[PDB]
Design a protein around this ligand. Structure first.
Ligand SMILES: NC(=O)c1ccc[n+]([C@@H]2O[C@H](COP(=O)([O-])OP(=O)(O)OC[C@H]3O[C@@H](n4cnc5c(N)ncnc54)[C@H](O)[C@@H]3O)[C@@H](O)[C@H]2O)c1
Ligand SMILES: NC(=O)c1ccc[n+]([C@@H]2O[C@H](COP(=O)([O-])OP(=O)(O)OC[C@H]3O[C@@H](n4cnc5c(N)ncnc54)[C@H](O)[C@@H]3O)[C@@H](O)[C@H]2O)c1
Ligand SMILES: NC(=O)c1ccc[n+]([C@@H]2O[C@H](COP(=O)([O-])OP(=O)(O)OC[C@H]3O[C@@H](n4cnc5c(N)ncnc54)[C@H](O)[C@@H]3O)[C@@H](O)[C@H]2O)c1
Ligand SMILES: NC(=O)c1ccc[n+]([C@@H]2O[C@H](COP(=O)([O-])OP(=O)(O)OC[C@H]3O[C@@H](n4cnc5c(N)ncnc54)[C@H](O)[C@@H]3O)[C@@H](O)[C@H]2O)c1
Ligand SMILES: [Mg+2]
Ligand SMILES: [Mg+2]
Lengths: 254, 254, 254, 254
């Protein structure tokens, strides 16, 4: 090991879902900086072209796809493999809807589980195929502190359920592909200052509880989550598989 | 304070999904014997009459219903509340399908998540509505050791993820309803000698591994899991909510 | 299994450390009620004779011993075995001292670790000997939510460390003696309304945080912890070993 | 935001206990290479000069000290702060002793807890005093997979408990010091090829079990653990506190 460059991704190609926004985009930045070539994936065209414009030459492909469409993920991988061999997958596509359990409509529940969990499996199966064949790769899933504990004061039982699945999916694929050289880990972030959370931050009857419940007393910055993903996705994490890495300002300690 | 009857369910009415087979049936027996009345729910009509014929007078209703059909769970709660106020719910309806991640049909993934996760939500929302209203209720979810660790040597990634979701779902509804007097807990059984594990117990290249990995060196008995559901469901467990109780012969210890 | 009497301890003898107060004494009550004969252990003579006076004929022996003195535990077991064969051990002797980490005196730290952890091992080794020889027994340790998360707002790093050890000691002995028929589990209680906590309850700048941090919004009652121990120590828990059972009003869910 | 140097330790001074051997030494190498200066601490004087002779100019001091001696850690912090303000602490000093629970000498139990647990507290209190004062610091504790699960087939109950205490100690000091800008995290390595595991790696009735139980089918390399300590210690991990990071080749996954 050469510690100086062991955190770099030189030569590597990363597929990132949810690349057009928030944490997904900051990981694209981090990975570009680190020597990686990129495959940007996002359902949102406007967002994607912005991502790509900014990331410039590190962009191998930019693909408009919904992670819940499993043949779009199979198609995306095939495209990917032609263009650059993909050795890293970051599953950042996710959504969160507030709801009370007794006033949940079936579509809200089904959709959160479809994006957060099904989509993550479809992407991991599509891209993990070529990794498992080469006997080499790394996957990093965006879980949440919500896969460990339950947020307060707001209710979103479908998000909590989805993040529980995410953590165990992570471990299930880690165990299954360990012997064949693919590592799979998850980040479990606390509150992060991105697009997913701005609406919730503008109400102080919520934001105040948030910070008082977090030992560091602040939201994380997207770059703080990106750095953790960078670590997990790089050769520095070569003995790290099936791990749930908490990046939460201590929220889960209390 | 009466310790000799703290574990009893006298004058309660419990709804049990998966009542037709294995652990769900043993639970009904356990609850019948502790003085509860039973609302029995299974998609298998044949299994239901057998269950009901055996339970006798303890049976207040038997309802053929697919837990994945949200509007059928809601109706089932309506029917059940009309016979007697339902103060206990056991979500035991569930499936397992073996599959290699790379060779997974979309439909297998979808269906395991539908029954194990979506179905538990649909039932819990339907039956918990009146409990929340009353300020009183106990729900027992069938989680698994598979929501904490990953089984070997067989592969079933959908199952691990579904059980991750079961544990977080349990915790989310525990948190949301604690203030209104409804407790929500899960069991995380190890291998149990039932119908769900018959095909696999017939295969020593799986079976000898199972016992080896189990400190107690044996499968659990359906009644060992039932006794533990009885605890969670009873007044004995009145300060226990959001708990995931391992009943696994030490499996998650190693 | 006969569910009606499966929670009873008829014929059994339980050694309980910390029997003179709080949770230890309420478990003596619960176990007496349930058909068990008792060995009371406590360093405090006044407390012990009060315990024994109240528990009456269920008391086989009453022994004044400090759990940190390992030959007193070896001696106590030998005495025990002459008088009644001890098939159940409850480790409830424990202490808690508030301190700031940077203003901790070495004696406070050493003493908490000595009572909470060393004492628990000395008792478990002394009494577990005869259980392991018979190939039968049950141990229940008093862990804490403090072995999982960190209390707030008060500081007691030595208590948190001690409870971490307690949970893993539990699992280590469960794994070691599983094959030889001794089960070992821990309770991890939340705030409980006993002697250990009255001082802390009388300051509202503390008590208020406590309840607001607990989903059920109340302290537990000693009987709620006793019922859980009763469950773990009885034949109902026969497939339950190495488990950490949270009894905390949901405190660890959030 | 500079991802190319986020993992660097330029201008920091790190104190490492257990610097003389195995993982503690590899960590020093890692930190030396990331631009940090080193305060080296070990009870073995011989091992220290070897460490220091190899590290070269990166070594600001080498201090022979027994971590179990509280007043020696305090003095060591005083000495170290006088050379350069210490902003990183790695608590790597630790031992393992195999013993059957029933045949355990008191002294073995005591000594494993003294080094692994008490010693980490003494060092963390001593070095964290000035860090807390500065409003800035990172501590990395050497936890273990043995603080989460129990090893097999060999028995070492003191070690499992000590590591339980290490994980909760880490979390307690994370919570207490988060508001004053000192992060505190632990690693939970799997088997690592070092001096601590040489005797046991020589015994195939243990060794073949070790690898079988490890999804990655191999021991970790000291440098794989070091790379992960570097992450925790660096600005890359700035929103990570109270985390227990598994570096175990998937061991805790099964
Ligand atoms: N506080 C936080 O932001 C926070 C905390 C913990 C975990 N996380 C998780 O980390 C991940 C990223 O969240 P973040 O805030 O950047 O979110 P974000 O909303 O800022 O970004 C999400 C991105 O995913 C895309 N997306 C949504 N559904 C999609 C679909 N079906 N197909 C393709 N793309 C889709 C959106 O277009 C968007 O670009 C999510 O999995 C989230 O649940 C976020
Ligand atoms: N080894 C084990 O048996 C084991 C271990 C851990 C957890 N569990 C969990 O315990 C629960 C019950 O398992 P068990 O072995 O009795 O299984 P089982 O297969 O014996 O019984 C399952 C019952 O659920 C019913 N069911 C299935 N889908 C349904 C649907 N959509 N609607 C209504 N009813 C439906 C089936 O008809 C059957 O009667 C499951 O959640 C399972 O995952 C089992
Ligand atoms: N809020 C709570 O009370 C709470 C919460 C979580 C866990 N617990 C744990 O459950 C257990 C019991 O606490 P509880 O409130 O009854 O405490 P308590 O102080 O009411 O009772 C403790 C008893 O243990 C005895 N004791 C203390 N040190 C001893 C020693 N060295 N040898 C023998 N006896 C000794 C005391 O004499 C007393 O009778 C402890 O392990 C405690 O840490 C308590
Ligand atoms: N398989 C593994 O090696 C493994 C796995 C998980 C965790 N760990 C943990 O990592 C840490 C370091 O282990 P490692 O294998 O390098 O061990 P090692 O035995 O190679 O190195 C331990 C170092 O600590 C020093 N030391 C011991 N007692 C001391 C004391 N009282 N004061 C000062 N120094 C003392 C020793 O001299 C030695 O240099 C330990 O806490 C260990 O429990 C090791
Ligand atoms: Mg919490
Ligand atoms: Mg395991």
């Amino acid at each position: 090991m050469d510690y100086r460059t062991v955190f770099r991704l030189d030569g590597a190609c990363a597929a990132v879902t949810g690349a057009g926004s928030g944490i997904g985009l900051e990981i694209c930045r981090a990975f570009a900086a680190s020597g990686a070539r990129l495959i940007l994936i996002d359902r949102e065209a406007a967002a994607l072209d912005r991502a790509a414009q900014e990331l410039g030459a590190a962009v191998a492909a930019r693909i408009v796809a919904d992670v819940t469409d499993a043949e779009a993920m199979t198609a995306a991988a095939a495209e990917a493999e032609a263009v650059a061999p993909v050795s890293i997958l970051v599953n950042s596509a996710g959504i969160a809807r507030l709801h009370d359990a007794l006033e949940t409509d079936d579509a809200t529940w089904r959709q959160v589980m479809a994006v957060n969990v099904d989509g993550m499996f479809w992407a991991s199966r599509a891209f993990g195929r070529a990794m498992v064949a080469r006997g080499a790769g790394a996957i990093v899933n965006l879980g949440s502190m919500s896969g460990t504990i339950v947020n307060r004061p707001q209710f979103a039982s479908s998000y909590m359920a989805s993040k529980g699945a995410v953590h165990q999916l992570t471990r299930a694929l880690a165990a299954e592909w360990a012997g064949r050289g693919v590592r799979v880990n998850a980040l479990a972030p606390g509150y992060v200052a991105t697009e997913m959370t701005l609406k919730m931050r503008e109400r102080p009857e919520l934001f105040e509880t948030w910070l008082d419940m977090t030992p560091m007393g602040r939201c994380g910055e997207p770059s703080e989550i990106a750095a953790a993903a960078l670590f997990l996705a790089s050769p520095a994490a070569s003995y790290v598989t099936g791990a749930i890495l908490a990046v939460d300002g201590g929220y889960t300690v209390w």
